[PDB]
Design a protein around this motif. Structure first.
Motif, mmCIF file in Angstrom:
data_model
loop_
_atom_site.group_PDB
_atom_site.id
_atom_site.type_symbol
_atom_site.label_atom_id
_atom_site.label_comp_id
_atom_site.label_asym_id
_atom_site.label_seq_id
_atom_site.Cartn_x
_atom_site.Cartn_y
_atom_site.Cartn_z
ATOM 1 N N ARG A 59 0.725 -1.193 -0.004
ATOM 2 C CA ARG A 59 -0.012 -0.008 -0.127
ATOM 3 C C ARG A 59 0.849 1.144 -0.057
ATOM 4 O O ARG A 59 0.574 2.388 -0.677
ATOM 5 C CB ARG A 59 -0.841 0.016 1.200
ATOM 6 C CG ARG A 59 -1.927 -1.279 1.281
ATOM 7 C CD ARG A 59 -2.926 -1.118 2.464
ATOM 8 N NE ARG A 59 -4.277 -0.363 2.440
ATOM 9 C CZ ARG A 59 -4.298 0.790 2.778
ATOM 10 N NH1 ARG A 59 -3.398 1.398 3.450
ATOM 11 N NH2 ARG A 59 -5.560 1.666 2.524
ATOM 12 N N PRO A 68 -0.816 12.665 -0.736
ATOM 13 C CA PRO A 68 -0.474 13.515 0.346
ATOM 14 C C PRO A 68 0.538 13.372 1.216
ATOM 15 O O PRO A 68 0.771 11.912 1.511
ATOM 16 C CB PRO A 68 -1.898 14.108 0.775
ATOM 17 C CG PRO A 68 -2.932 13.549 -0.051
ATOM 18 C CD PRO A 68 -2.322 12.669 -0.849
ATOM 19 N N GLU A 69 0.879 14.061 2.124
ATOM 20 C CA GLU A 69 2.137 13.792 3.122
ATOM 21 C C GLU A 69 1.560 13.446 4.386
ATOM 22 O O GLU A 69 2.251 13.415 5.408
ATOM 23 C CB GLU A 69 2.860 15.028 3.249
ATOM 24 C CG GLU A 69 4.297 14.803 3.230
ATOM 25 C CD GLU A 69 4.618 14.532 1.628
ATOM 26 O OE1 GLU A 69 4.327 15.268 0.770
ATOM 27 O OE2 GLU A 69 5.422 13.491 1.300
ATOM 28 N N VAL A 70 0.080 13.162 4.597
ATOM 29 C CA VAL A 70 -0.435 12.791 5.664
ATOM 30 C C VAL A 70 -0.786 11.285 5.737
ATOM 31 O O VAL A 70 -0.507 10.411 6.579
ATOM 32 C CB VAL A 70 -1.824 13.662 6.222
ATOM 33 C CG1 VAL A 70 -2.900 13.122 5.463
ATOM 34 C CG2 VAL A 70 -2.021 13.325 7.739
ATOM 35 N N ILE A 71 -1.280 10.747 4.404
ATOM 36 C CA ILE A 71 -1.221 9.392 4.066
ATOM 37 C C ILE A 71 -0.282 8.718 4.237
ATOM 38 O O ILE A 71 -0.034 7.447 4.693
ATOM 39 C CB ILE A 71 -2.139 9.433 2.800
ATOM 40 C CG1 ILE A 71 -3.197 10.256 2.735
ATOM 41 C CG2 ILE A 71 -2.569 7.843 2.517
ATOM 42 C CD1 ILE A 71 -4.645 9.909 3.455
ATOM 43 N N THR A 102 -2.125 21.005 0.898
ATOM 44 C CA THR A 102 -2.111 19.281 1.337
ATOM 45 C C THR A 102 -2.339 19.465 2.849
ATOM 46 O O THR A 102 -2.899 18.298 3.430
ATOM 47 C CB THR A 102 -0.784 18.730 1.027
ATOM 48 O OG1 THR A 102 0.145 19.618 1.348
ATOM 49 C CG2 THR A 102 -0.818 18.203 -0.248
ATOM 50 N N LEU A 120 -6.078 18.567 4.159
ATOM 51 C CA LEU A 120 -6.117 17.190 4.421
ATOM 52 C C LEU A 120 -5.814 16.648 5.709
ATOM 53 O O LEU A 120 -6.531 15.786 6.546
ATOM 54 C CB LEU A 120 -5.494 16.116 3.463
ATOM 55 C CG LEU A 120 -6.157 14.841 3.427
ATOM 56 C CD1 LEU A 120 -7.730 14.681 3.670
ATOM 57 C CD2 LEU A 120 -5.790 14.075 1.777
ATOM 58 N N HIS A 137 -8.422 15.190 8.281
ATOM 59 C CA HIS A 137 -7.822 13.937 8.983
ATOM 60 C C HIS A 137 -7.814 14.077 10.409
ATOM 61 O O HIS A 137 -8.596 13.282 11.155
ATOM 62 C CB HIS A 137 -6.679 13.531 8.497
ATOM 63 C CG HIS A 137 -6.172 12.119 8.926
ATOM 64 N ND1 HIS A 137 -5.445 11.632 10.008
ATOM 65 C CD2 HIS A 137 -6.699 11.160 8.148
ATOM 66 C CE1 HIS A 137 -5.307 10.516 9.923
ATOM 67 N NE2 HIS A 137 -5.785 9.962 8.826
ATOM 68 N N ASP A 143 -8.193 4.820 3.009
ATOM 69 C CA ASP A 143 -8.693 4.682 1.623
ATOM 70 C C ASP A 143 -9.549 5.873 1.541
ATOM 71 O O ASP A 143 -9.679 6.450 0.607
ATOM 72 C CB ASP A 143 -9.155 3.613 0.929
ATOM 73 C CG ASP A 143 -7.999 2.528 0.717
ATOM 74 O OD1 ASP A 143 -6.964 2.949 0.618
ATOM 75 O OD2 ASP A 143 -8.353 1.327 0.505
ATOM 76 N N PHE A 145 -10.018 8.680 3.181
ATOM 77 C CA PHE A 145 -9.470 9.944 3.254
ATOM 78 C C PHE A 145 -8.715 10.238 1.786
ATOM 79 O O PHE A 145 -8.903 11.327 1.202
ATOM 80 C CB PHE A 145 -8.616 10.174 4.167
ATOM 81 C CG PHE A 145 -8.953 10.588 5.641
ATOM 82 C CD1 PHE A 145 -9.635 11.810 5.829
ATOM 83 C CD2 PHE A 145 -9.388 9.626 6.606
ATOM 84 C CE1 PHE A 145 -10.378 12.264 6.831
ATOM 85 C CE2 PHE A 145 -9.925 9.948 7.703
ATOM 86 C CZ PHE A 145 -10.599 11.374 8.042
ATOM 87 N N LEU A 146 -7.762 9.376 1.238
ATOM 88 C CA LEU A 146 -7.231 9.412 0.119
ATOM 89 C C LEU A 146 -8.050 9.780 -1.083
ATOM 90 O O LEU A 146 -7.958 10.606 -1.945
ATOM 91 C CB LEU A 146 -6.476 8.500 -0.269
ATOM 92 C CG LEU A 146 -5.757 8.295 -1.858
ATOM 93 C CD1 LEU A 146 -4.373 9.357 -1.623
ATOM 94 C CD2 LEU A 146 -5.494 6.887 -2.093
ATOM 95 N N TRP A 185 -9.479 13.106 -1.017
ATOM 96 C CA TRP A 185 -8.703 14.054 -1.625
ATOM 97 C C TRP A 185 -8.687 13.979 -3.076
ATOM 98 O O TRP A 185 -8.595 14.945 -3.856
ATOM 99 C CB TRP A 185 -7.124 13.908 -1.086
ATOM 100 C CG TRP A 185 -6.147 14.800 -1.878
ATOM 101 C CD1 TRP A 185 -5.401 14.423 -3.019
ATOM 102 C CD2 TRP A 185 -5.630 16.007 -1.361
ATOM 103 N NE1 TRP A 185 -4.648 15.400 -3.205
ATOM 104 C CE2 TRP A 185 -4.928 16.437 -2.533
ATOM 105 C CE3 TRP A 185 -6.101 16.650 -0.408
ATOM 106 C CZ2 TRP A 185 -4.239 17.661 -1.971
ATOM 107 C CZ3 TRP A 185 -5.449 17.885 -0.398
ATOM 108 C CH2 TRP A 185 -4.294 18.431 -1.029
#
Ligand SMILES: [Zn+2]
Lengths: 346, 174, 99, 99, 98, 97
Positions: free
Chosen positions: A295, A305-308, B14, B17, B21, B48, B50-51, B54
């Motif tokens: 993943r 993004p930089e949080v995921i 970004t 997010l 979150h 997934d 949250f992504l 986005w």
């Protein structure tokens, strides 16, 4: 008839040596890379290609028979295949052949920061809480201050903890040419989070100089507690120095880039009565590690993004920790019946 | 100017997010725990959700809509796992640790079976060696027919074109 | 009868007793100092001038009195003579034999 | 035994305080008396600054009574210690120290 | 104790054991219950009925078959050599394991 | 009673139970008693050739049937399982001569 008399007598030995395992050794001993979190196909109940039970990596399941069943019997020893690439040998090689997972991001080994004393934090000098803040992706740590200054101009020191806002603000004030500088440039501003920062810090470490500095600090300190801390760190530093005499034993090997996978016969998967199956927890833990790594790789492929990415990397670290030492975790992984899973250390 | 998080998401920043979150992570975790019982899969589905928020950030219209989106999507992800054969198969598998001292009385084998299997293999090999020794005593054409049929394999078509005889003649000779 | 196995375990594991009696290590005159946080301070001034300070819980009975002279190996308060105190005072052979 | 062996090994040796102009000796290095004398003679033959050394100081220690559990866990064999208690800790120290 | 106890059936009891066999639908084929099971002498299948089940009244000496069963064996890809060997010798090794 | 029977596929050691035709357990205390007596040979046979020396047990059965000398025991398989677990924990365990 009687068993085949294997003339390969065991090689007698008088000693056992232990030490940190390098990624190169793990790759050199491995027969392949486990790429899928599958164990057996649900439709055929046969080991999956590039899975945890793969016959390409860990060996054939049948005696002197390959996967596609084209080469058979003793006449065909050592011929892998033209089609399924599965060596025609004894199935017992499933107890000796190992695999590996190439982690996209380094993951710290739980032992060396959870079994007290805190080895990584004793070498770096950071207290355990700050080291955990580094490991679980909560703060950035600067490895080289460079020409970067503070938000108000204060000198930035090595091993400073900065949040995401602070890191972005400091990167803003940096010159545009500095970001593209090589890693060997003394003026480059390098700040990292997670296990990569620990890798860089432990690689830049110098054990002899560190030991001399700690002896000096112990010899010229007016506080008993500071002296005790200095000598406690000196213990681990000198232990590493003594290890480096017998073999090669580097601190960076405490942070693992490759995860070895033990032979499948030691983590069995058995069919039971009523048509159900029973698996070892090690299969589940390896599954979690592979899923998190895959993943994370896919997320980096799409420029997430930089949080995921942060959450995925922290989850991958947690999965590796559960694989090695599940009990040491604050929240151990558990079944639906609230029974913690069994790891390699358990 | 302190814009609301909706416009931060709409802009393409970004850190937006990060804001959504940090605000709705635990709510989505609760939503997932209501529908499934695997914390690992729930965390995957939260990431997934949250992504995909986005990715679909160009489809929002209201500050509350964002929240709705999250909840909606996360639920359906759980729902889809009721249909996946992989998940059903993996949840139909127990853990060997559920049986105490399972290494003592379970997962066993008898070497007599292995020796018997190897003896059967040797018997088959001896039969095939007998057949191979009989082969040279046959007519040359019928010997080459069998030899080709043992290295390509009862391929009446490709053999017939190779030989000259038809499918029917070649099958009859085999 | 059952109060024997825990005692053997405590002795074999070098565990201090639940009531470790403070034992003077030098010969000298004993005096009572200021009470600090509920613990009385016993100051022993030796014949050669060596001063040693000990802390004794006020709840625990004090065997020694003020202006008294005591020799090494004498308990200043009620309790059990701990093995490591015996090691420190009487020596290693003595602690082995006592154990 | 290790304490005695270390004390005997460092007995009769000297620690260099100033290396002078010697290219083979360094400050903080422990060398034998014969080696120090040879280096001093070589430097004197070359009209260079002599190497100054001080007598090695032996460590001081006291006998200590250890519990059976700690003594078992502090054995020189990490295989024996890892099979009794605290396997993770013993294996960690053994790996870091390369026993 | 006296041998009269054994002689008069004083301390004799009866203990019943239940043995259950599942025959299920596996991928390789539906396993069958039959008295004709491979590579076993005709004497050991003498007391079994059509469904491979021991008769009421038989003596279960150690090692006797109670519920005979055949499971479809693992045919791999039918290599040409196996095809010829079965063509000439016959299907002696029919695909059924005890 | 068991002479030989089913073994485990993980530890390569005799199973446990009358239903499984398993073998009796020679635990830690029995090993302590054997060590106290000084029986190196009996302890060695119990550790290697009677439990998990896969080649050794077959060779010993053959040697008893044929009357020959007893085979030289080899490394137990449980030790190899331990070594593989240690390697799976990222430790470089090396056996040296
Ligand atoms: Zn093949």
């Amino acid at each position: 008839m009687a068993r085949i008399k294997d003339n390969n007598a065991p090689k007698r030995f008088n000693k056992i040596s232990i030490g940190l395992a390098s990624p190169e050794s793990i790759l050199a001993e491995s027969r392949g890379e486990v790429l899928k979190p599958e164990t057996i196909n649900y439709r055929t109940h046969k080991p999956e290609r590039d899975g945890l039970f793969c016959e390409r990596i860990f060996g054939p399941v049948k005696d002197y028979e390959c996967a596609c069943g084209k080469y058979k019997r003793i006449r065909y020893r050592g011929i892998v295949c033209d089609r399924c690439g599965v060596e025609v040998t004894e199935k017992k090689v499933r107890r000796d052949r190992v695999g590996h997972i190439n982690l996209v991001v380094p993951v710290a080994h739980i032992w060396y920061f959870r079994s007290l004393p805190n080895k990584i934090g004793y070498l770096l000098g950071l207290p355990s809480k700050k080291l955990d803040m580094i490991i679980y992706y909560e703060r950035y740590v600067v490895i080289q201050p460079g020409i970067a200054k503070g938000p108000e101009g204060e000198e930035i020191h090595k091993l400073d903890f900065l949040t995401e806002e602070e890191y972005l603000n400091i990167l803003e004030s940096l010159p545009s040419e500095n970001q593209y500088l090589e890693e060997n440039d003394p003026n480059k501003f390098i700040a990292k989070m997670g296990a990569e920062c620990l890798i860089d810090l432990l690689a830049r470490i110098d054990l002899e100089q560190l030991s001399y500095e700690l002896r000096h600090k112990a010899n010229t300190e007016t506080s008993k507690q500071r002296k005790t801390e200095a000598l406690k760190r000196l213990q681990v530093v000198e232990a590493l120095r003594e290890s480096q005499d017998n073999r090669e034993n580097n601190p960076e090997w405490m942070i693992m880039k490759v995860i070895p996978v033990i032979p499948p016969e030691l983590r069995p998967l058995v069919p039971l009565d009523g048509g159900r199956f029973a698996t070892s927890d090690l299969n589940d833990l390896y599954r979690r590690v592979i899923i998190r790594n895959n993943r994370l790789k896919r997320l980096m492929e799409i420029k997430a993004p930089e949080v995921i990415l942060r959450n995925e990397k922290r989850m991958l670290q947690e999965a590796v920790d559960s694989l090695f030492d599940n009990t040491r975790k604050a929240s151990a992984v558990k079944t639906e019946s609230n029974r913690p899973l069994k790891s390699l250390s358990d | 100017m302190l814009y609301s998080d909706f416009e931060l998401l709409k802009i393409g920043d970004t850190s937006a997010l990060d804001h959504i979150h940090a605000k709705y992570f635990r709510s989505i975790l609760w939503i997932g725990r209501q529908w499934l019982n695997d914390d690992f899969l729930i965390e995957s589905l939260v990431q997934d959700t949250f992504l995909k928020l986005w990715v679909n950030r160009d489809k929002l219209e209201s500050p509350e809509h964002i929240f709705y989106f999250l909840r909606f999507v996360m639920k359906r992800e759980c729902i889809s796992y009721y249909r996946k054969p992989k998940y059903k198969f993996h949840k139909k598998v127990n853990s060997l640790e559920d049986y105490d001292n399972y290494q003592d009385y379970m997962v066993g084998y008898d070497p007599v079976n292995d020796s018997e299997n190897l003896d059967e293999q040797e018997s088959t090999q001896k039969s095939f060696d007998h057949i191979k020794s009989i082969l040279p005593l046959l007519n040359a054409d019928k010997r080459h027919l069998i030899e080709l049929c043992l290295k390509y394999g009862f391929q009446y078509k490709a053999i017939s074109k190779v030989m000259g005889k038809g499918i029917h003649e070649t099958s009859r000779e085999i | 009868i059952t109060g024997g196995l825990p005692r053997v375990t405590e002795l074999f594991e070098a565990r201090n007793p639940s009531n470790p009696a403070v034992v003077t290590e030098i010969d000298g005159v004993v005096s009572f100092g200021k009470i600090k946080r509920g613990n009385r301070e016993i100051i022993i001034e030796s014949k050669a001038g060596e001063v040693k300070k000990y802390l004794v819980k006020l709840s625990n009975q004090i065997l020694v009195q003020e202006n008294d002279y005591v020799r090494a190996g004498m308990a200043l308060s009620d309790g059990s003579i701990t093995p490591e105190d015996i090691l420190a005072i009487k020596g290693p052979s003595a602690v082995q034999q006592y154990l | 035994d290790d304490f005695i062996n270390e004390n005997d090994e460092i007995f009769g040796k000297k620690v260099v305080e100033d290396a002078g102009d010697s290219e083979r000796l360094k400050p903080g290095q422990i060398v034998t008396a014969r080696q120090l004398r040879d280096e001093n003679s070589i430097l004197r033959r070359e009209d260079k600054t002599l190497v100054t050394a001080r007598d090695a100081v032996a460590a001081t220690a006291t006998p200590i009574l250890q519990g059976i559990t700690r003594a078992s866990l502090q054995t020189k064999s990490f295989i024996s210690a890892a099979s009794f208690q605290e396997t993770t800790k013993v294996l960690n120290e053994a790996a870091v120290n390369g026993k | 104790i006296s041998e009269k106890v054994v002689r008069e059936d004083i301390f004799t009891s009866v203990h019943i054991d239940e043995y259950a066999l599942e025959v299920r639908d596996t991928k390789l084929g539906a396993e069958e219950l039959t008295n004709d099971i491979p590579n076993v002498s005709e004497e050991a299948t003498r007391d079994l009925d059509e469904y491979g089940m021991i008769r009421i009244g038989a003596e279960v000496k150690p090692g006797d078959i109670l519920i005979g069963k055949i499971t479809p064996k693992g045919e791999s890809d039918p290599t040409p050599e196996e095809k010829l060997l079965r063509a000439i010798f016959g299907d002696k090794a029919g695909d059924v394991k005890d | 009673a068991r002479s030989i029977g089913p073994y485990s596929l993980i530890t390569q050691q005799p199973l446990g139970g009358k239903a499984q035709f398993g073998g009796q357990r020679f635990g830690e205390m029995e090993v302590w008693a054997l060590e106290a007596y000084g029986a190196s040979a009996t302890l060695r046979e119990i550790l290697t050739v009677k439990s998990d020396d896969v080649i050794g047990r077959a060779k010993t059965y053959e040697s008893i049937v044929k009357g020959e000398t007893m085979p030289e025991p080899g490394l137990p398989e449980s030790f190899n399982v331990l070594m593989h677990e240690l390697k799976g924990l990222g430790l470089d365990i090396r056996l040296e001569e």
